[PDB]
Design a protein around this ligand. Sequence first.
Ligand SMILES: OC[C@H]1O[C@@H]2O[C@H]3[C@H](O)[C@@H](O)[C@@H](O[C@H]4[C@H](O)[C@@H](O)[C@@H](O[C@H]5[C@H](O)[C@@H](O)[C@@H](O[C@H]6[C@H](O)[C@@H](O)[C@@H](O[C@H]7[C@H](O)[C@@H](O)[C@@H](O[C@H]8[C@H](O)[C@@H](O)[C@@H](O[C@H]1[C@H](O)[C@H]2O)O[C@@H]8CO)O[C@@H]7CO)O[C@@H]6CO)O[C@@H]5CO)O[C@@H]4CO)O[C@@H]3CO
Ligand code: CA
Length: 585
Amino acid sequence: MLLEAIFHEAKGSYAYPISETQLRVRLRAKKGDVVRCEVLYADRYASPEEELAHALAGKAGSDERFDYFEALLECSTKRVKYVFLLTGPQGEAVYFGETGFSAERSKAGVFQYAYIHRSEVFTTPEWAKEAVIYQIFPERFANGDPSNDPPGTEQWAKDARPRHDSFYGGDLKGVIDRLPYLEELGVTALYFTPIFASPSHHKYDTADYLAIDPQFGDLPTFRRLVDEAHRRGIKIILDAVFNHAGDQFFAFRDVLQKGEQSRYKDWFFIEDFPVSKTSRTNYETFAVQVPAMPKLRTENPEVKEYLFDVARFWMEQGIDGWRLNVANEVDHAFWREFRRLVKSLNPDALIVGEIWHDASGWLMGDQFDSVMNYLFRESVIRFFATGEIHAERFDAELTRARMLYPEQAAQGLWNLLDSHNTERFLTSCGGNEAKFRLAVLFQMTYLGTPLIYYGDEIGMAGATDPDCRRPMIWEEKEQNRGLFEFYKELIRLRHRLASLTRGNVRSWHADKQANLYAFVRTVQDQHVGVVLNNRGEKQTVLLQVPESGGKTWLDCLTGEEVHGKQGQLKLTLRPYQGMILWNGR
Ligand SMILES: OC[C@H]1O[C@@H]2O[C@H]3[C@H](O)[C@@H](O)[C@@H](O[C@H]4[C@H](O)[C@@H](O)[C@@H](O[C@H]5[C@H](O)[C@@H](O)[C@@H](O[C@H]6[C@H](O)[C@@H](O)[C@@H](O[C@H]7[C@H](O)[C@@H](O)[C@@H](O[C@H]8[C@H](O)[C@@H](O)[C@@H](O[C@H]1[C@H](O)[C@H]2O)O[C@@H]8CO)O[C@@H]7CO)O[C@@H]6CO)O[C@@H]5CO)O[C@@H]4CO)O[C@@H]3CO
Ligand SMILES: [Ca+2]
């Protein structure tokens, strides 16, 4: 077996505890190269003459090129030394340890996890483990208060087509009025984009981190929404824009005024004075040359404590969490501390990060709890919407992302389809509703936290920013209530099947020819199998289903009963159909 392709490290996403006494270990190797993987272990100070405990590493999944093996280690001592025993497709065995590969357990060495401190067990909020979040872009959801509209507000019609500077009147009062709709739908949390004082319609260019923007309301109205939402089982997550401030932020303006006499010049990255008010900025900003968004020096204690107080104040209004905008561009020390402050102020406040590349650095358990799953979106787009990838590539991409981080994080990844930064999924699907629904059926049953973008639930469409930010369709006859009900039902299933919210994932079938993909979620003795006929034609499959995990399943969407004959289940699905099979346990 190609030894150069065998990986593992006693830390990170390959070694970590899931309790003060249990260590999870994962190992990867070239696909099909290793057939069996066992973990021989013991206490670090245990005598050489003592008996080595065993542990069988299960084949947790396999992507395009790798096989992932996973096993659990019981460590009452909270200290452990372990070595792997890999067997090839032809009896060939070999030990794998910190020293290297040897046919003699001794010469291979033995990996070590020095100690499992209880304060380092990756822990995330319990409510966020089984949530369905709804993303609200305030300016475009509901105008409940006509009196606070910006000047030049355009019509709130379905044929409306926003500009980079348009305003429609969306406010917090509108949200509050819509809580019945949100509750009917079944969402358990609402993610808001920035809602703090700022001149734009997106408000990511913060003018005052301590005041709800005037066109959105006031502290009372906000407090009111938080309460009205809570009594309906709906939590509130706000968008923290800590990487940069808007050029209206008091501190920036003071610099713009007093130049390098400013008590706040080191709160930013100023290269020379005076500070530019042109198209050529002489201060660091978000992205490239974006005058309105100067970068905050979060490394500066002065700036850190301020932003931290901004956190305290909103946390004092009762919000349940944060989504950290452009988080990968602010220092780790800030986030570790931000975590200690947040989590001490409220143990159940969820911290979600927005990173557009491997986020394993912020997902060890001492910073964020999860992040936006842009990976889930790229896989879903290319599989369901554009048809650029088949069931087997889909399976792979899905699995590679699964192994990226520790389970605590993976379990809570915000699985989105689109955002206020992309074309609307239904549009990615070229208006094809059939394909659209299958993606939702998948999103609502897959591993992670499903995130619904306002309007998708009733059929809205649109190109990227700003056409994806159209005013919400509220007139019932202009809404696809058929879809609404579809969402509602799936949302009820997810809440009802513990498997769907707390189980693990395992591929079940993937025919690249038929383009049929299926997986199975499992928690304790419950099993739920999702079959997806992602093709425009009627098709028939035979899925391998040993009767140890049940010989009978029930299609949760239709109520049809299916049975296994000699360990094989034969299904027939209509074009673009998907069945959600519960094993009754
Ligand atoms: O004024 C700027 C901008 O501010 C706000 O944007 C915030 C946004 O809403 C938050 O979500 C977050 O953004 C993060 C984003 O969500 C992540 O996906 C990621 O972004 C990456 C992109 O995904 C990736 O595509 C790539 O981006 C490249 C583009 O693909 C490429 O086309 C090009 O983009 C240019 C645009 O085409 C062009 O229109 C122009 O952009 C203007 C916007 O059109 C306009 O709406 C506005 O945008 C606001 C926005 O509305 C606010 O919500 O002004 C823009 C110019 O000022 O110019 C673009 C390039 O100059 O090039 C990009 C660059 O590669 O990479 C990115 C980054 O990896 O990360 C984002 C940051 O975390 O935060 C922002 C800011 O707070
Ligand atoms: Ca308004």
